[PDB]
Amino acid sequence: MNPFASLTLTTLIILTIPIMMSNSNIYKTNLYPNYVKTTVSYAFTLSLVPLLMFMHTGQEMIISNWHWMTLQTVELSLSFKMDYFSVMFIPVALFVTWSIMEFSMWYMHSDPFINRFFKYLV
Amino acid sequence: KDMFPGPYPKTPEERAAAAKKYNMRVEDYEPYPDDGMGYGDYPKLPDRSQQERDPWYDWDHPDLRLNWGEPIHWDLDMYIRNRVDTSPTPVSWNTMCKHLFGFVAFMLFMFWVGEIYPSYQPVGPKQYPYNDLYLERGGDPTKEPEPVVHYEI
Amino acid sequence: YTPDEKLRLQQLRELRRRWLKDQELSPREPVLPFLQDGAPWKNVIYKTYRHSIFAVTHVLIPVWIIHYYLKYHVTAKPYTVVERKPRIFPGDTILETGEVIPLMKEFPDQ
Amino acid sequence: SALLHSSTMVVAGVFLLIRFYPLMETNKLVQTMTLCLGAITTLFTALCAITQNDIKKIVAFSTSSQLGLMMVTIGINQPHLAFLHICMHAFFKAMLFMCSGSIIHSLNDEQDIRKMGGLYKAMPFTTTALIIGSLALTGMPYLTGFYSKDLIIEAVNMSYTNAWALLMTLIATSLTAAYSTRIIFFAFLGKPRFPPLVLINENNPLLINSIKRLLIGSIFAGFIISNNIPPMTVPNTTMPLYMKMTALIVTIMGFMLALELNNTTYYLKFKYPSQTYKFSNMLGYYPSIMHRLPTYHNLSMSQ
Amino acid sequence: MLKIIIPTTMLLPMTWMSKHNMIWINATVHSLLISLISLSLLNQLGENSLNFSLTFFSDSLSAPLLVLTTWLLPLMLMASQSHLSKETTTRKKLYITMLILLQLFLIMTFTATELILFYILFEATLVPTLIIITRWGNQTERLNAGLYFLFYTLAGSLPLLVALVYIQNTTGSLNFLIIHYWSHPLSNSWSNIFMWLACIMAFMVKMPLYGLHLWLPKAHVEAPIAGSMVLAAVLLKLGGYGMMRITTILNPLTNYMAYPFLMLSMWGMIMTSSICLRQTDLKSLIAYSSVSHMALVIVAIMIQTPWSFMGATALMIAHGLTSSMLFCLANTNYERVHSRTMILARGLQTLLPLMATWWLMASLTNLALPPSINLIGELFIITASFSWSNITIILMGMNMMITALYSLYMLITTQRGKYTHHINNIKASFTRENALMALHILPLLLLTLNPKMILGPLY
Amino acid sequence: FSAPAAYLTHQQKVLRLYKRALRHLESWCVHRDKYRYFACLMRARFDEHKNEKDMVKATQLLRQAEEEFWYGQHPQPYIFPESPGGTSYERYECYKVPEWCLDDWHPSEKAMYPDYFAKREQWKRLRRESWEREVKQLQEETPPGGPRTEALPPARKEGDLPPLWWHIVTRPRERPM
Amino acid sequence: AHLARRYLGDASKEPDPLRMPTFPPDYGFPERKEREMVATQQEMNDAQLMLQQRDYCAHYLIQLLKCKRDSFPNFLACKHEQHDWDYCEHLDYVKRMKEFERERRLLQRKKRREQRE
Amino acid sequence: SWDKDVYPEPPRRTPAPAPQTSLPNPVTYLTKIFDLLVDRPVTLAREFIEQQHAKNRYYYYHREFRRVPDITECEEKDILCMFEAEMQWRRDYKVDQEIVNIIQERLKACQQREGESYRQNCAKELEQFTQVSKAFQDRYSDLGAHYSARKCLAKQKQRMLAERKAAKE
Amino acid sequence: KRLFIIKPSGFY
Amino acid sequence: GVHIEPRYRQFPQLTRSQLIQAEFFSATMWFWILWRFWHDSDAVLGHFPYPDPSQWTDEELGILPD
Amino acid sequence: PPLTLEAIKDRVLYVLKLYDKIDPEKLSVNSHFMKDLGLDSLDQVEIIMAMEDEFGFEIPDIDAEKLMCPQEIVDYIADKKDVYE
Amino acid sequence: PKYKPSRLATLPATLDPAEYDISPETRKAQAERLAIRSRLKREYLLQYNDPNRLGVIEDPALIRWTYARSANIYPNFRPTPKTSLLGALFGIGPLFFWYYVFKTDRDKKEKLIQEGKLDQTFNISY
Amino acid sequence: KMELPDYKQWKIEGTPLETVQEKLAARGLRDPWGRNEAWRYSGGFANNVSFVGALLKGFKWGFAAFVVAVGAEYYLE
């Protein structure tokens, strides 16, 4: 139960790393699409674990980490609903995205802005 | 000052001067009907989109498909290639509208008919225990539910 | 083609081909003259080293940070990580123990 | 188009409806509206796809029809079945789109099926992947699509349902089988129709590996997920045999009828288009009057 | 509050006694410092306002606007450096002093405790604006534009002066605190109806109500870049702030008198967004977009619910920033091609890539893309109006759709397509313009992390 | 391309219809053998009345064919990828940077391509010198009341270039990348 | 089938799927013993079964859930337990199906009773 | 840390692990790997940071405002009393908003925790939220964007007049 | 053959 | 890269790993289908026979004679 | 695989050779279809169609009707594809 | 059959009778049109291929189009009965329609609140 | 450089284009482009499998592995 929250949040956080690094020198080289593909693959591998936990027990949670603003009697907070739907759809989406990104590294090779294409995909 | 749009031309001399101003021919130049809408002497070019124009011609502006100095239609912005297109279609417009709207109406009517005559299987209503899960389905615990009993058949 | 048209086309073709040949890079294009690519990256391992440093910087640091935030946040504020109650079957629990097996019918067939 | 508008983005609405399932269960009018909308989408989009000549367009209309089927599954108060169908449809439809993209790239940005042919043995790996994906889409038993589409059809049949919606769903399944035949006959079978200077090549590690992973996923993930997820819906154990086989029967009928018409195309009997063919090819005329009249009225009013 | 007023006044002798090579530099430095100091005003209390003295006060409504003005002055200087480069030193100093006087007057409007002092300064803001529009404008229509703007504002505001003096005579005071505590219900007599109008029409003219909005397109098109920036960012929010301040003494007659204005704004948003759909001038399109956005603030103020006021404040701040940035982008395009025709220069996405990203982000903020404060304000106002009446949602959704349509249409027309062949004067964008866009965007995106700051006193 | 004409003759219009008819026939008859069979039959029809001399009847022959063509026109005819209405139409238009953008480069940027820029300046010199001839040449050959066709004269004498050549010659390629 | 009889034939003689049942339960049969429920409310709640999944076959479903939880990682070690649940559902569906025809037969015998007068 | 009375949590009933198959449960191995590679370094870092915090231990206090006479006990134009009462009323309004927020947090926690049996097992939480919501809507609602203590007093007087009229009928 | 790529000034 | 040389109206060009992968995966799909059908033919056909309505008797449905 | 001038010439001559109405032996680079060969306007249209469907790019009608010489076709294709060698 | 054209689907050039007029007058008209077009193109290309131009080739046509759309509307406006009636029905018509709709909705809501027949169980945010 | 195949090896003999030529000869016409379109029916492009053959691709080894795998279960249980 304790590893569940960490893994579920990391699977989403890791996807933001290529966006952050797009300001660095990696974005200017030809290694960026491969870095993006590897990041997505690692994200899928990490997302497999919460799916295994759910299959084993049925672990479903809600992570209301950041409190954004409270409008009198209404509290709006950054909350993620980690349930059957999310925990199962995340690995499928990441797997498809990984395959698509490899197929794009092949297909969109000639494009002058392939780094932009991969960044938009992420 | 004389190369700006002016009032609606009235004399044939004004109609020739306006035609010369807009780089047109006097015979071809036709201003909008002077109904007071404020069009003025601006020509009423044919109401055809920028998609009908010859795509193989070497236009001064390729995407807009226009030539420098050529008079610009009043509704150019509406008639650009990114917007309303008046190019001819294989099927006549009336036929397309008739077929589309008839198909939609037929679908809606048939769905209404199917609602009148729904599809179902030859089985009784599925029964549940505890008076149809009265308490489970947000029921009042204080009030005792009406007895719902299902027998073995 | 009229003769003037053909001659103009030929001359334009000559000029266009000259321009296209001009649009060709020389044997070199001078690139401006890398401490991180010196001693750190002379011939550093392009295998295990890279595939491990990437894994670290992309999963291990984020997971450490998120887990530490899940020490800063979860038990410091109520109703922040609400886990669905684990399903309870006719089995033994942990803290209090106990169990109640249900009365069972019998149908070996199917 | 393979990532967003095939597997992940276009299912956002279906996932939104799935998310609010405990609320839609209480209401009844909304369920009927979802069911009717889904049936309309399935029938219309499949009918449009049958006479499309652009492979990407055919696959897009297939995505639309599958989304309509998911909406129908929502209308039958079967949300988890719709989610499972989303999961499987992502798997096989992304692979279908990737195969289409491989075909396009190999033939130098050619997307019209009429100028593609004889690719069965010229591109064996993409041919295999396309065949497997089409079989999964058409609910071939014990594939990824079998654990979703077959169960959806079975549930729809054994439920209190709008009859015409059920009829439209069955016809839509037949037409899915039909357009699948189209993307095989006019693309891989027959004699080549692409221009000379053949540049067909697919021995790229990236393309092969991606399509291979999606193949493994479109073959076995269905079984794995179905056997691993907890049961969330009462199964339709007993059902009339003919109703139990309806899905396969309709798929076979669609396969046979489409292939028959595909063979008749060879016959030197050039005719003129029928009204129905024009209706289908022109997408029911919908993106011709609804994209000209409302837009013109709004813009002219604004001006 | 003098910690901000005194340096603003001292900006004038500083610029007047500065070398001809240092007016812009010194002005920027010390305007930015003044904004940094005014950032301290955001520490508002939960219930009570910050009463500095008898004359000046600030609450969670005044502080965001003050910060916006103090932040916008340097941006105006940076935007106006370009075209005012061949002007003589004295006229450059005069322009800078006009901007400084406008900023000072705006600060003293947003901080005034007396309604009549607020009126005096909020009408004093006309003179620097009018001069800026009619003296440094480029076209020949700047003279008519200045008259339209000036006369619309004055014809709206003079009955407000009469009503304020009448209220002073009858109630004994015009202080905001006293007029808020000693508040009394207005009867349904004709006299109260006309007092309500006199108090309302003045601010309805300022934030352009549909029908009284004809001055805004002329003013925003014919004025220089800095003038358009203030007119769009602060001079429109003046009316909203005044209405939110005065609605305290206009109840409960508003419940029945707000219907004409509510309907006018809820239809004018659609009408002006449709007008934007069919505009040929970039600045005119931006001005009509501003009208459409301010219609929502008018609705929110006229509904008088806490969510409506929060959405109104958020939308005011967000719209000010977005409109200022859009006008700056249009100014850059104009300074490049020397024409405001939208269809003139095309395919700018291939010649100016970073400017294209700035256009994209500005348009996304304009169409209320989550989680921007634009969307926060729009959604709060939409929820408030839906609670007011469920039918409102149709107009709100149509307005959102048309806003997205015309914003993306502007993006496609300007920063997309095939480049204009004959145009050859498009040089690489300067560091100054990119810095201006960055300073417009970054606070806007950062405010989404702490939206509570700009959500008004009812948060 | 080539300069157009004020009108299309009956010969030109018939040929234009013929190409459209065969291309639409290709779209309908997907199979190559099937198309070739009906292509000759189409060719026969365009040769049945080729020798018809009555232009009134010849125009009437055209009219009936166009009406037949429009009704038998394929709703979704095949379009070449790099053609108007094609899937790859204007696809690389966002990469065609005009040549004058190179003059705005920073000297450091120009320092990385010395040979290209040096050769580029020679092209600028050629345009600057030849322009006066082109201005002169156009005036001479042009009829007094301006031109009446878009066709431009070639380089009549030596040491001269076709007038108005720069943009046609220095145009961006089809795949600038 | 039965749909055609209620739509093309005698609708009155065909049972209404929604109004079913109409005839009294004990009517006809000399006596009808009620249906026993093996699972208790607490067990189904502690098992967090879905409301639609709380029919009479709930106990078999609970056993299947327990085996699935315990047999992990082996996800193919519950064929017997799965077969137990679906067979019960077949029994219930057959029981429900009989109810439909009881309604039809009682309707026709009512029509015979109607025609008797 | 938080008072469990304010935020009630039911006792945790977690089923015991009773495997029947002999296959190695990958979940257990993955959890051990996680506890070795993430938990241990995170716990060590938290231990270090908590030691550093305990080295410099300082306090902050909860400001307490004494009760002030309400708007009811306030003369017509007594601006000082009115200001005091208005500030106290605004503080009470904020406190009641936070009370409603706490009740809503309880309701959300109950809804998530109970899983598929939330409808029956959160009736008490729903009842508490209904009571608090009705009370809040009676007190703080329809006041408008320019609410004041005088306006609540007026609404309460209107409600009490309605109650008297109902009682006398 | 490596062909020169015509780009707008990206230095600024 | 010209490891796969282009062509003309001549016949196409192939390699070994490509054909091997295609045939292997097609055979794997068919093998999976056959294996699952042999093990789990119930899913396609049915596990429990659909009961025969008319077959049931009146007393069985609790019905008395007219 | 960029097209070269000689490759384009070879392919054009290939297409012309595969035309039975043109005898390959007398076929040359400068074989004017109207004058040297017996090809009429319809034959010109058909050969232009063959060239455009062999190279996979359409030739405009106002350009198609003015090719005649096969070398004209070769150089026009080289212009469209920007072949300078 | 025959093709019926509309405003959104114009008559194709092939099915247009005017495309087939070979009368010398029509040919002369086409010649004049081509002459005007070629003169304009020549001027534009002379300004466009000039190596001494470092600005924008101002287009009088675009300027006239912009002026006529914005600045020439009112001076050429005459308050005819058609214009006045259209202006009224498009300006105050929708306003009164929306006022009626919203007023009726608000009146219904207020009536339901007054009689207590409207449920507001959890309406604590407005 | 691509070695262009000899243009004389393209013949309509046996190819389905020949059937078209015979029918055209019945009407007194001759196909003028059969040789240019004959490569599509020649070489390795001459024999594509049927629709049923395409779907049954790999069924030979699939059935072979299935029988072998089935024997293993029956043998070891």
mmCIF file of C-alpha atoms in Angstrom, chain L residues 17-60:
data_model
loop_
_atom_site.group_PDB
_atom_site.id
_atom_site.type_symbol
_atom_site.label_atom_id
_atom_site.label_comp_id
_atom_site.label_asym_id
_atom_site.label_seq_id
_atom_site.Cartn_x
_atom_site.Cartn_y
_atom_site.Cartn_z
ATOM 1 C CA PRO L 17 -22.596 27.962 -71.156
ATOM 2 C CA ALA L 18 -20.465 31.119 -71.048
ATOM 3 C CA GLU L 19 -17.287 29.009 -71.168
ATOM 4 C CA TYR L 20 -18.173 28.034 -74.746
ATOM 5 C CA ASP L 21 -18.853 31.473 -76.244
ATOM 6 C CA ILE L 22 -16.521 31.974 -79.213
ATOM 7 C CA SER L 23 -18.160 35.221 -80.421
ATOM 8 C CA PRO L 24 -15.469 37.848 -81.166
ATOM 9 C CA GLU L 25 -16.847 40.213 -78.517
ATOM 10 C CA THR L 26 -16.262 37.670 -75.744
ATOM 11 C CA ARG L 27 -12.770 36.946 -77.091
ATOM 12 C CA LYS L 28 -12.004 40.675 -77.073
ATOM 13 C CA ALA L 29 -13.283 40.937 -73.492
ATOM 14 C CA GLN L 30 -11.014 38.065 -72.455
ATOM 15 C CA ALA L 31 -8.118 39.776 -74.241
ATOM 16 C CA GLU L 32 -8.734 43.014 -72.329
ATOM 17 C CA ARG L 33 -8.935 41.131 -69.026
ATOM 18 C CA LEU L 34 -5.665 39.355 -69.812
ATOM 19 C CA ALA L 35 -4.040 42.660 -70.777
ATOM 20 C CA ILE L 36 -5.037 44.315 -67.488
ATOM 21 C CA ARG L 37 -3.892 41.262 -65.527
ATOM 22 C CA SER L 38 -0.558 41.149 -67.363
ATOM 23 C CA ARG L 39 0.058 44.864 -66.793
ATOM 24 C CA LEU L 40 -0.599 44.447 -63.069
ATOM 25 C CA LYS L 41 1.643 41.368 -62.956
ATOM 26 C CA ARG L 42 4.407 43.215 -64.810
ATOM 27 C CA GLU L 43 4.269 46.097 -62.335
ATOM 28 C CA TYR L 44 4.301 43.722 -59.362
ATOM 29 C CA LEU L 45 7.221 41.698 -60.741
ATOM 30 C CA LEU L 46 9.191 44.856 -61.545
ATOM 31 C CA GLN L 47 8.720 45.957 -57.938
ATOM 32 C CA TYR L 48 9.330 42.388 -56.735
ATOM 33 C CA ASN L 49 12.506 41.500 -58.652
ATOM 34 C CA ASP L 50 14.064 44.915 -58.008
ATOM 35 C CA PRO L 51 17.288 44.386 -56.006
ATOM 36 C CA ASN L 52 17.059 47.944 -54.679
ATOM 37 C CA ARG L 53 13.718 47.469 -52.892
ATOM 38 C CA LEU L 54 13.998 46.864 -49.136
ATOM 39 C CA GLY L 55 10.388 47.137 -48.012
ATOM 40 C CA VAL L 56 6.768 46.110 -48.574
ATOM 41 C CA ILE L 57 5.159 46.329 -52.017
ATOM 42 C CA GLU L 58 2.068 48.302 -51.038
ATOM 43 C CA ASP L 59 -1.045 46.920 -52.727
ATOM 44 C CA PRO L 60 -3.672 49.588 -53.540
#
